Design a protein around this ligand. Structure first.
Ligand SMILES: [Cl-]
Length: 175
């Protein structure tokens, strides 16, 4: 079972924190979005377009269940997995770390390298705030560890998580 399943919105630093965390623990990193493409031979977009959302969500659910069963390291969950009731069921009992950010932090962090994001018009930011309103409540439901990642460096976020994922040395009996 994973040492940690990471969840959060775009902008939360999920990819960089996942890698860093796996590095510090010395464990494997498995990303469910990448795993779906590796198991199907098709892009996320292709599956959506041709089989439809519900079927994408069944395929993802299967992948996530397998990963929770078989992976021992860090599991980075794709952004919409938690909309699936079966995913939220399958997560129960696991260690689930929610990289929590505000709507405003997220907007700022997903603007890219352009210097004047407001000039492209409000639609991208509006769609981002909508997503957060739909996903955030689901992430708070499934979390076992919430981590405030607003204006914190990824290094400090990794330390925070490691301080709360400690494993005692085994007893002589255990050995
Ligand atoms: Cl680190």
């Amino acid at each position: 079972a994973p040492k940690a399943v990471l969840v959060g919105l775009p902008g939360s630093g999920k990819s960089t924190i996942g890698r860093r965390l796996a590095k510090a623990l010395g464990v494997g990193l498995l990303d469910t979005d990448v795993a779906i493409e590796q198991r199907t031979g098709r892009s996320i977009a292709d599956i959506f377009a041709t089989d439809g959302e519900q079927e994408f969500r069944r395929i993802e659910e299967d992948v996530v269940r397998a990963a929770l069963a078989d992976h021992d390291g860090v599991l980075s969950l794709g952004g919409g997995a938690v909309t699936s009731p079966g995913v939220r069921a399958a997560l129960a009992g696991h260690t689930v770390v929610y990289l929590e950010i505000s709507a405003a932090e997220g907007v700022r962090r997903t603007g890219g390298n352009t210097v004047r994001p407001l000039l492209a018009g409000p639609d991208r930011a509006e769609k981002y705030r909508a997503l957060m309103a739909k996903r955030a409540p689901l992430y708070r439901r499934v979390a076992t560890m919430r981590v405030d990642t607003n204006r914190r460096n990824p290094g400090a976020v990794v330390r925070h998580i490691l301080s709360r994922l400690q494993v005692p040395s085994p007893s002589e009996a255990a050995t």
